[PDB]
């Protein structure tokens, strides 16, 4: 067979936490700093 | 003056093109007085003209290397000295009517059958230019030669 109960259950939990990681990283990557500072 | 044209000839070792390359340089030199004492607004022609003596050598060495490579427009030059193998003795060496199966196969010519051997006097034996495994016999040579 292509998949086992072990392998599959692993993949199912892996994807859920992978989506969480993707969500977190997504917002982290879309994070900018300032072009310039306001004043002296 | 020698090193660079030589390395070119190694990269460009083709007898037939060596002729073309040499003749081009000769033409430019023979017209040197007419080309130099003129206007040549096209820098591409002027550039190759200025290097005409460099090209001349590249052609001359390209001929030399092409002959050793034994390739003139993908053609070998058989001087009637190709004695790599003696086919009559091939059939003696337990090859009887192989041309029957041959219709669908190649069959590689064995080394050290006791009847083959002897180096080609100059360059690569022409026989390899018509083989299906040229691409391994001569490929190995060029790799090792480049390193040397």
């Amino acid at each position: 067979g292509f998949f086992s109960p072990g392998i599959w259950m692993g993949l199912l939990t892996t994807l859920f936490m992978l989506f969480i990681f993707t969500y977190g990283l997504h917002m982290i990557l879309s994070l900018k700093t300032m072009d310039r500072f306001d004043d002296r | 003056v020698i090193t660079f044209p030589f390395l070119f000839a190694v990269m460009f070792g083709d007898f037939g093109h060596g002729i073309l390359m040499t003749l081009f340089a000769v033409w430019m030199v023979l017209r040197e007085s007419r080309i130099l004492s003129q206007k040549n607004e096209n820098e591409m022609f002027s550039m190759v003209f200025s290097g005409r003596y460099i090209i001349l050598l590249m052609g001359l060495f390209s001929i030399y290397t092409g002959l050793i490579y034994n390739d003139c427009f993908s053609k070998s030059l058989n001087i009637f000295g190709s004695s790599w193998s003696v086919r009559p003795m091939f059939t003696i060496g337990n090859w009887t009517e192989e041309t029957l199966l041959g219709s669908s196969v190649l069959q590689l010519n064995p080394a050290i059958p006791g009847v083959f051997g002897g180096p080609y006097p100059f360059g690569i034996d022409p026989i390899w230019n018509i083989a299906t495994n040229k691409l391994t016999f001569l490929n190995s040579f060029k790799m090792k030669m480049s390193v040397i």
Binding site: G1, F2, F3, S4, I7, L11 | -
Partner: protein, 52 residues
């Protein structure tokens, strides 16, 4: 011969699972890296404004 099976890899699911996701992740890493290099921003300044 007798409609015999060809022995469809015992533990197939293991080799399969490993190779699938390993080559998929590595292939994507190359694709993303290639994308980032493909679109490298030279700055489009300094001399580019004049050459354009």
């Amino acid at each position: 011969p007798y409609n015999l099976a060809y022995k469809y890899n015992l533990e197939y699911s293991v080799v399969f699972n490993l190779v699938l996701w390993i080559m998929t992740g590595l292939a994507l890493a190359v694709i993303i890296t290639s994308y980032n290099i493909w679109n490298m921003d030279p700055g489009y300044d300094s001399i580019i404004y004049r050459m354009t």
